[PDB]
Amino acid sequence: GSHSMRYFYTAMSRPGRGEPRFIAVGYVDDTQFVRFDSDAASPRMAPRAPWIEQEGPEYWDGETRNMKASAQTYRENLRIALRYYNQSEAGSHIIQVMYGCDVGPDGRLLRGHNQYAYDGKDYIALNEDLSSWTAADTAAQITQRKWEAARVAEQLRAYLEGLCVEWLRRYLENGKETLQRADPPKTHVTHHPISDHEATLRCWALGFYPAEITLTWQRDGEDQTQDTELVETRPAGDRTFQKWAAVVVPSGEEQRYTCHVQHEGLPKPLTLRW
């Protein structure tokens, strides 16, 4: 997978507090470029990256009308799910969707995506063939039957192989100074005694794009997988990411440990020590 485009929808009911909220976001790789929120004072598809700003009024109005139509559709799907699961109109529930395309270095489709969740649990997914469906339960088998009867997989496939890939290639060209630029991690090791007899070694990665990274500790050349604490990769707020990995080591043994860093932006993997 050299690049991807992805749309994420969350529709959330709230009985007594008006109609379900609908929010959409779009990403190229780890870069957000668009947002819609039906709770905004005036809801439209709105820019979140500088390279999308140049698209004209036809684009923004087209995307706005689709987001408006989608909010209504997902509100109905919330009503339908209650009848599928024998649930009441008094409780609050959530539908999520993720869809889109991965392209290789030469711009051709590597793979297409389209999955749904209901209350945070797998519901239905388009299979990698872009023709058949995996339902997670007997409710999602009803939807599967409906989608088979309407030839829905065919429509997605036309989109996933066609417009998805074509617009992705457009955005990569307009956003090439940032979207087609990897920023390698800045790395260092810190040392914090905890007693006379132990100390923490923490291996830091800062300032990197994209998010994907591997940090690992070796003691005497052996991976310390069960003994290493890893934090979740976290956003810095300036488009880049941060991560660390820590190990607790007997005092006097710090030089038996090496940190290893892998990232797309590095010509080769790095080895660091305290």
Partner: peptide
Amino acid sequence: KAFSPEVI
């Protein structure tokens, strides 16, 4: 550019 919505 987004796709159209589907009824479950």
